[PDB]
Design a protein around this nucleic acid. Structure first.
Ligand SMILES: [Mg+2]
Ligand SMILES: [Mg+2]
Ligand SMILES: [Mg+2]
Ligand SMILES: [Mg+2]
Ligand SMILES: [Mg+2]
Ligand SMILES: [Mg+2]
Ligand SMILES: [Mg+2]
Ligand SMILES: [Mg+2]
Ligand SMILES: [Mg+2]
Ligand SMILES: [Mg+2]
Ligand SMILES: [Mg+2]
Ligand SMILES: [Mg+2]
Ligand SMILES: [Mg+2]
Ligand SMILES: [Mg+2]
Ligand SMILES: [Mg+2]
Ligand SMILES: [Mg+2]
Ligand SMILES: [Mg+2]
Ligand SMILES: [Mg+2]
Ligand SMILES: [Mg+2]
Ligand SMILES: [Mg+2]
Ligand SMILES: [Mg+2]
Ligand SMILES: [Mg+2]
Ligand SMILES: [Mg+2]
Ligand SMILES: [Mg+2]
Ligand SMILES: [Mg+2]
Ligand SMILES: [Mg+2]
Ligand SMILES: [Mg+2]
Ligand SMILES: [Mg+2]
Ligand SMILES: [Mg+2]
Ligand SMILES: [Mg+2]
Ligand SMILES: [Mg+2]
Ligand SMILES: [Mg+2]
Ligand SMILES: [Mg+2]
Ligand SMILES: [Mg+2]
Ligand SMILES: [Mg+2]
Ligand SMILES: [Mg+2]
Ligand SMILES: [Mg+2]
Ligand SMILES: [Mg+2]
Ligand SMILES: [Mg+2]
Ligand SMILES: [Mg+2]
Ligand SMILES: [Mg+2]
Ligand SMILES: [Mg+2]
Ligand SMILES: [Mg+2]
Ligand SMILES: [Mg+2]
Ligand SMILES: [Mg+2]
Ligand SMILES: [Mg+2]
Ligand SMILES: [Mg+2]
Ligand SMILES: [Mg+2]
Ligand SMILES: [Mg+2]
Ligand SMILES: [Mg+2]
Ligand SMILES: [Mg+2]
Ligand SMILES: [Mg+2]
Ligand SMILES: [Mg+2]
Ligand SMILES: [Mg+2]
Ligand SMILES: [Mg+2]
Ligand SMILES: [Mg+2]
Ligand SMILES: [Mg+2]
Ligand SMILES: [Mg+2]
Ligand SMILES: [Mg+2]
Ligand SMILES: [Mg+2]
Ligand SMILES: [Mg+2]
Ligand SMILES: [Mg+2]
Ligand SMILES: [Mg+2]
Ligand SMILES: [Mg+2]
Ligand SMILES: [Mg+2]
Ligand SMILES: [Mg+2]
Ligand SMILES: [Mg+2]
Ligand SMILES: [Mg+2]
Ligand SMILES: [Mg+2]
Ligand SMILES: [Mg+2]
Ligand SMILES: [Mg+2]
Ligand SMILES: [Mg+2]
Ligand SMILES: [Mg+2]
Ligand SMILES: [Mg+2]
Ligand SMILES: [Mg+2]
Ligand SMILES: [Mg+2]
Ligand SMILES: [Mg+2]
Ligand SMILES: [Mg+2]
Ligand SMILES: [Mg+2]
Ligand SMILES: [Mg+2]
Ligand SMILES: [Mg+2]
Ligand SMILES: [Mg+2]
Ligand SMILES: [Mg+2]
Ligand SMILES: [Mg+2]
Ligand SMILES: [Mg+2]
Ligand SMILES: [Mg+2]
Ligand SMILES: [Mg+2]
Ligand SMILES: [Mg+2]
Ligand SMILES: [Mg+2]
Ligand SMILES: [Mg+2]
Ligand SMILES: [Mg+2]
Ligand SMILES: [Mg+2]
Ligand SMILES: [Mg+2]
Ligand SMILES: [Mg+2]
Ligand SMILES: [Mg+2]
Ligand SMILES: [Mg+2]
Ligand SMILES: [Mg+2]
Ligand SMILES: [Mg+2]
Ligand SMILES: [Mg+2]
Ligand SMILES: [Mg+2]
Ligand SMILES: [Mg+2]
Ligand SMILES: [Mg+2]
Ligand SMILES: [Mg+2]
Ligand SMILES: [Mg+2]
Ligand SMILES: [Mg+2]
Ligand SMILES: [Mg+2]
Ligand SMILES: [Mg+2]
Ligand SMILES: [Mg+2]
Ligand SMILES: [Mg+2]
Ligand SMILES: [Mg+2]
Ligand SMILES: [Mg+2]
Ligand SMILES: [Mg+2]
Ligand SMILES: [Mg+2]
Ligand SMILES: [Mg+2]
Ligand SMILES: [Mg+2]
Ligand SMILES: [Mg+2]
Ligand SMILES: [Mg+2]
Ligand SMILES: [Mg+2]
Ligand SMILES: [Mg+2]
Ligand SMILES: [Mg+2]
Ligand SMILES: [Mg+2]
Ligand SMILES: [Zn+2]
Lengths: 13, 204, 174, 37, 140
RNA sequence: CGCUGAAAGCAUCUAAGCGGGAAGCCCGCCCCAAGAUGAGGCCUCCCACGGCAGCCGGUAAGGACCCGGGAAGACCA
RNA sequence: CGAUGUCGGCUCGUCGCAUCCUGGGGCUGAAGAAGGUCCCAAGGGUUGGGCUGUUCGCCCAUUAAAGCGGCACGCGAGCUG
RNA sequence: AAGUCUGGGCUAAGUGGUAAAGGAUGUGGCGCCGCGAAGACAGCCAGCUGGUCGAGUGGCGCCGCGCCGAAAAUGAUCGGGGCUUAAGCCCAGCGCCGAAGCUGCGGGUCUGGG
C-alpha cells in the first residue's frame, strides 16, 4: 500500500 | 377519503390531562363544492373545493363562468380532494372530530439557494488543521475515469423548501366549529398565513 | 404393469359425461369436473369408463395413467366420498367444533380457528380426533395437511397434530 | 439439506428424484437429503 | 432513363387481428407493411407504407417459457435505475406495449423510422377507434 | 415445505394441475411529472372583423409592460 | 516520460455479494434457551474511544452487528499533507 | 440485399447465445447379458422360498443432444428486435443475394507486336 511516488511533487518554475 | 382547505394561523400549547400539548391552529371552513369530478365525465372521483371569499372586482370572466354554473360566490382558492364526495353543498371542520388522525399538506418555508450543509446535512469541511476555503463545501462529487461522470440525483446545493410537503397522522386535538377552527397536534408545513390542506389520514 | 388401460368400475348410479378436455362426474354426493388432455380419449362403456392414449411415447404414457386415476378418483368421490382423520396427541391439546368451524387448542398462547372451505366438512368425535370429509380428493388431502401444519408432530415428544396411521418416530433427549 | 456438485445415493433407501430442473436426493433419513448445487 | 420515383399517394389503412399469433412472426410482417416494402414503387426515403391497426393485442401468443422468462428493461439514468419487467406482467398491465416494442425494434432507427412507428396503431381488446378511415382487413 | 399424481401396479412437490413461503420483488405511502412531440382530460370565457392553411390592420376573452410589495427570490420566475 | 500527481486521513458517495446484522429456510451429535453448518436474501443497518502517518493490527467500552471487496489500491482543477 | 425454401432427424435448455473434474431414472438411438405363462420385477398375505396378479422386468456398456457443477463489482442485451416440427443443431438438396474479384460498354497511359 505504501508504494513509492513516481512524480517529484511540484516545484515552482 | 375526506378533506378540507384551510390556512395555517399559528401555534400554541394547550393543556389536556396535566399535559402540555403543542398545537398548530388551522382555519379550515367553510369550503363550498364548486365542481364534482365524476368517472363518466372526468374518469376519476373528486370534489373541487373553493376557499376564502374574493372581491368580484378581481375575478375575470372565464373564472366568473365557472363559479356561476355552481351558484357559488367568487372564491380566492380552488383545490380538489381525491375520492371524497360530501353529501352537502358545503364542507366544514365538522367532518373532523377530536381524536381523529389527519394528513396536513402545505408549502414549506423557502430557503432559496441552500448550501450543501443546510440542504442535505453534509458535514462540510474542518474548521482548522489546514482546511482551505472548504469549510462548507461538499467534498468529492465522483470517482475518476470510471464512470467519468456524476450520477443523476447527486445531492448538491440549490433551491430548498417552498415545495409541497405533507406530514402525516396528526392528532386532532379539538375542533371549534363556531370559528371554523381546527387544532392539530404538532407541526405543519409552511408559514403562518399559508394555505394548507387537511385530509383524513392514510395511516392505520 | 399399467394404470391408464386398467378400466374404471362405475357404481350405480353415477353418470360420466365426456367433453373435449373435460369429463363431468355426477353422483349421490355431488358433481366434479375433471380436466383432461385433449390428446387422451375418454370412453363411455357399460358400467365402465376407459381412457385410451394415442401413442406409446413418453408424454402420452405419463398422461394416460394420470387421466385414468383422475377420473377414477372423481367416481369414488361422488359415490363413497373422501375423508382423512387427524389424531391429536399432547396433554393440553384438544380440538372442538364451533359451528362449521374447527377450533384447535394446541399449545399456543391463543387458540387457532380453521374455517372449512366449500365442499369440506369438519367433525369432532373425541376431543382428539378430527375428520375432514369432502367429495374432492385433492381438496380433502389439502385441508387435512393444512390442519396438521398448525402444529406438526414433535421430533422428541409424542405431541402435536398427527395423521391417522402415521408412525411416531422420535429422537432422544440428552 | 446438503448442497453439492456430487449428489449420490448414501443408503439403499435413498432415491434420486429430479424436480424443476434440479437433481435432488431424498430419503427416509433426513441427513441424506441432498440438492445439487 | 432514370428510376421512377413516386409522387405522394393516399396511404392504405389496414386491420390485423392478432389473436393467437406468434409475437415475433406477426411483428415481422407489421414492419414490412409499415415500410411499404410490399409496394412495387417502394422508396427508402419517404413514408409511403401503410397504416396498420391491430386488435386483440392482449391475445398475442408466444412459445417456450417466455411468459415468465422474457424480460423487458428500462434504465432511468439514476443509480440502481434498471427496472426489469417480465412478459407476463407486461401483458397484465400494458399489453399493447408487447407488440409495440417488438415492431419498434424491427423498424429502422432515425427520423423516418420513428415516423413509421407512429403509423402503428395497437389495441388490446377486439375494438379500435378508426372506423372513420375504414381500414382493410388483412389475413397474415 | 406440501396436496393431488403418472411415466415406473410401488414410490415420487411435477411430467397435467393446485397450495404454503422472505426485511427481498410488484403495488400500496410521500414528492416530481403530458417536451408522455404518444405534447392527455374536465369546467369556464371570447368569437362568426376590415384589405388585396398566406399577408397587413384594428379588436374580443385574456395577457404583458410599469408601480406598492412579499416567511417567494442571486437575476429570472 | 512535448507529465496519466503518487500512501493514509477528511468529505461525498455508488456498486458487487463469496452475508457481519436484521428477514426466510433445510440438516444437527437440534430437549428448552443458546450455538454449529449449509441454503435463500444486497432492503436497510454496520458505534465511540487509546496507540501508530499508517492502511492493517492490537486494545478499552458498547452493540442486532461492529462484513469483505470494486470503482485509476473511487475521489489533491474537492480539502489535508 | 436475397428462402418465413424442400426433404429426414435431434434438442425444451432461450441449450443455441462463454468454462473443468465430477455428479444425475433428462431425452432419443444402438448393444449386452440376468430373471419370467414351470407365473418373473412391483403391490399386498406367510416364512432367499410360498400364495392371486398376468405380463414383462432388472442390471452393464456404447452414441447423439441436453442438466447441474457456474460468484464481482455504472444498465442490461445472442449486434438488436425477436426466434421453439426454429429464425437452434445434424445430414441432404434447389434457388437467390452479395466486393473496387470476374463480365459487358466507353476512355487514359505505358509496354510489346502489326
Ligand atoms: Mg504545479
Ligand atoms: Mg373513481
Ligand atoms: Mg379513480
Ligand atoms: Mg370512492
Ligand atoms: Mg396547494
Ligand atoms: Mg450560509
Ligand atoms: Mg446554515
Ligand atoms: Mg435539511
Ligand atoms: Mg463535521
Ligand atoms: Mg462542522
Ligand atoms: Mg468530521
Ligand atoms: Mg473531522
Ligand atoms: Mg495550505
Ligand atoms: Mg495557502
Ligand atoms: Mg479558512
Ligand atoms: Mg469540495
Ligand atoms: Mg485522482
Ligand atoms: Mg462513462
Ligand atoms: Mg420555489
Ligand atoms: Mg398528497
Ligand atoms: Mg401512532
Ligand atoms: Mg403516533
Ligand atoms: Mg397393462
Ligand atoms: Mg387403452
Ligand atoms: Mg401431509
Ligand atoms: Mg459424495
Ligand atoms: Mg448405496
Ligand atoms: Mg418451485
Ligand atoms: Mg423416500
Ligand atoms: Mg409460430
Ligand atoms: Mg402471424
Ligand atoms: Mg405481407
Ligand atoms: Mg402458439
Ligand atoms: Mg411461456
Ligand atoms: Mg449511476
Ligand atoms: Mg433505485
Ligand atoms: Mg444488479
Ligand atoms: Mg428504477
Ligand atoms: Mg446504422
Ligand atoms: Mg412427503
Ligand atoms: Mg400422495
Ligand atoms: Mg400414488
Ligand atoms: Mg397409485
Ligand atoms: Mg407442474
Ligand atoms: Mg416439461
Ligand atoms: Mg404457489
Ligand atoms: Mg401447507
Ligand atoms: Mg420492516
Ligand atoms: Mg402534482
Ligand atoms: Mg399538455
Ligand atoms: Mg399536469
Ligand atoms: Mg399529434
Ligand atoms: Mg418515447
Ligand atoms: Mg393540455
Ligand atoms: Mg383522463
Ligand atoms: Mg366580433
Ligand atoms: Mg376580403
Ligand atoms: Mg395588433
Ligand atoms: Mg413586482
Ligand atoms: Mg423567501
Ligand atoms: Mg424584487
Ligand atoms: Mg421584472
Ligand atoms: Mg511518464
Ligand atoms: Mg499533451
Ligand atoms: Mg502538460
Ligand atoms: Mg495534463
Ligand atoms: Mg483519522
Ligand atoms: Mg455500501
Ligand atoms: Mg449466496
Ligand atoms: Mg462461499
Ligand atoms: Mg434469521
Ligand atoms: Mg439472517
Ligand atoms: Mg436460521
Ligand atoms: Mg431451537
Ligand atoms: Mg445440545
Ligand atoms: Mg441442549
Ligand atoms: Mg449446530
Ligand atoms: Mg459444510
Ligand atoms: Mg440454521
Ligand atoms: Mg443488504
Ligand atoms: Mg444495491
Ligand atoms: Mg453495501
Ligand atoms: Mg471510531
Ligand atoms: Mg491522550
Ligand atoms: Mg486514532
Ligand atoms: Mg490505526
Ligand atoms: Mg489484514
Ligand atoms: Mg501495523
Ligand atoms: Mg502486537
Ligand atoms: Mg445475536
Ligand atoms: Mg473500530
Ligand atoms: Mg473481520
Ligand atoms: Mg467496506
Ligand atoms: Mg465502499
Ligand atoms: Mg490496484
Ligand atoms: Mg479498491
Ligand atoms: Mg482504500
Ligand atoms: Mg487512492
Ligand atoms: Mg477502501
Ligand atoms: Mg480528481
Ligand atoms: Mg492538492
Ligand atoms: Mg491525497
Ligand atoms: Mg482532473
Ligand atoms: Mg420452412
Ligand atoms: Mg437452466
Ligand atoms: Mg440464449
Ligand atoms: Mg446460457
Ligand atoms: Mg463433461
Ligand atoms: Mg445418454
Ligand atoms: Mg436409453
Ligand atoms: Mg410378488
Ligand atoms: Mg444454468
Ligand atoms: Mg451474479
Ligand atoms: Mg446469486
Ligand atoms: Mg466491473
Ligand atoms: Mg446477422
Ligand atoms: Mg426441417
Ligand atoms: Mg479489376
Ligand atoms: Mg476495355
Ligand atoms: Mg508498363
Ligand atoms: Mg510499331
Ligand atoms: Zn438414505
Amino acid at each position: 500500500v505504501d508504494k513509492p511516488p513516481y512524480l517529484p511533487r511540484p516545484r515552482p518554475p | 377519503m375526506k378533506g378540507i382547505l384551510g390556512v395555517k394561523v399559528g401555534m400554541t400549547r394547550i393543556f389536556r390531562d396535566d399535559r402540555a400539548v403543542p398545537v398548530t391552529v388551522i382555519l379550515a371552513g367553510p369550503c363550498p363544492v364548486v365542481q364534482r369530478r365524476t368517472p363518466e365525465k372526468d374518469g376519476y372521483t373528486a370534489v373541487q373545493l373553493g376557499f376564502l371569499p374574493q372581491n368580484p372586482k378581481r375575478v375575470n370572466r372565464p373564472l366568473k363562468g365557472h363559479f356561476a354554473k355552481a351558484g357559488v360566490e367568487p372564491v380566492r382558492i380552488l383545490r380538489e380532494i381525491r375520492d371524497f364526495n360530501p353529501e352537502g353543498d358545503t364542507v366544514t371542520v365538522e367532518i373532523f372530530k377530536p381524536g381523529e388522525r389527519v394528513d396536513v399538506t402545505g408549502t414549506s418555508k423557502g430557503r432559496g439557494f441552500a448550501g450543501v450543509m443546510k440542504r442535505w446535512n453534509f458535514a462540510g469541511g474542518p474548521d482548522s488543521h489546514g482546511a482551505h476555503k472548504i469549510h462548507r463545501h461538499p467534498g468529492s462529487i465522483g470517482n475518476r475515469k470510471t464512470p467519468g461522470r456524476v450520477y443523476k440525483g447527486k445531492k448538491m446545493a440549490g433551491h430548498y423548501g417552498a415545495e409541497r410537503v405533507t406530514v402525516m397522522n396528526l392528532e386532532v386535538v379539538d375542533v371549534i366549529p363556531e370559528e371554523n377552527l381546527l387544532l392539530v397536534k404538532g407541526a405543519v408545513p409552511g408559514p403562518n398565513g399559508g394555505l394548507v390542506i387537511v385530509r383524513e389520514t392514510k395511516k392505520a | 404393469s399399467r394404470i391408464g388401460r386398467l378400466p374404471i368400475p362405475v357404481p350405480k348410479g353415477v353418470s360420466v359425461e365426456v367433453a373435449p378436455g373435460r369429463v363431468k362426474v355426477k353422483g349421490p354426493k355431488g358433481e366434479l369436473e375433471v380436466p383432461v388432455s385433449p390428446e387422451m380419449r375418454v370412453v363411455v362403456e357399460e358400467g365402465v369408463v376407459r381412457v385410451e392414449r394415442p401413442s406409446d411415447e413418453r408424454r402420452h404414457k405419463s398422461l394416460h395413467g394420470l387421466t385414468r386415476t383422475l377420473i377414477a378418483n372423481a367416481v369414488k368421490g361422488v359415490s363413497e366420498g373422501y375423508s382423512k382423520e387427524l389424531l391429536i396427541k399432547g396433554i393440553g391439546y384438544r380440538a372442538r367444533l364451533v359451528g362449521r368451524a374447527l377450533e384447535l387448542t394446541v399449545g399456543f398462547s391463543h387458540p387457532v380457528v380453521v374455517e372449512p372451505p366449500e365442499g369440506i366438512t369438519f367433525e369432532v368425535p373425541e376431543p382428539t380426533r378430527v375428520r375432514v370429509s369432502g367429495i374432492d380428493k385433492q381438496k380433502v388431502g389439502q385441508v387435512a395437511a393444512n390442519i396438521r401444519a398448525i402444529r406438526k408432530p414433535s421430533a422428541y415428544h409424542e405431541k402435536g397434530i398427527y395423521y391417522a396411521g402415521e408412525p411416531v418416530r422420535l429422537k432422544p433427549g440428552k | 439439506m446438503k448442497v453439492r456438485a456430487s449428489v449420490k445415493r448414501i443408503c439403499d433407501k435413498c432415491k434420486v428424484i429430479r424436480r424443476h430442473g434440479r437433481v435432488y436426493v431424498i430419503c427416509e433419513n433426513p441427513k441424506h437429503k441432498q440438492r445439487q448445487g | 432513363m432514370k428510376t421512377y420515383v413516386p409522387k405522394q399517394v393516399e396511404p392504405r389503412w389496414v386491420l390485423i387481428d392478432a389473436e393467437g399469433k406468434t409475437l415475433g412472426r406477426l411483428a415481422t410482417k407489421i414492419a414490412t407493411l409499415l415500410r411499404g416494402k410490399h409496394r412495387p414503387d417502394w422508396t427508402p426515403n419517404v413514408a409511403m407504407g401503410d397504416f396498420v391497426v391491430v386488435v386483440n393485442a392482449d391475445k398475442i401468443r408466444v412459445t417456450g417459457k417466455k411468459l415468465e422468462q422474457k424480460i423487458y428493461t428500462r434504465y432511468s439514468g439514476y443509480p440502481g435505475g434498471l427496472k426489469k419487467i417480465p412478459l407476463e406482467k407486461m401483458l397484465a398491465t400494458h399489453p399493447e406495449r408487447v407488440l409495440e416494442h417488438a415492431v419498434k425494434g424491427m423498424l429502422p432507427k432515425g427520423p423516418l423510422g420513428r415516423r413509421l412507428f407512429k403509423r402503428l396503431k395497437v389495441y388490446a381488446g377486439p375494438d379500435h377507434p378508426h372506423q372513420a378511415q375504414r381500414p382493410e382487413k388483412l389475413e397474415v
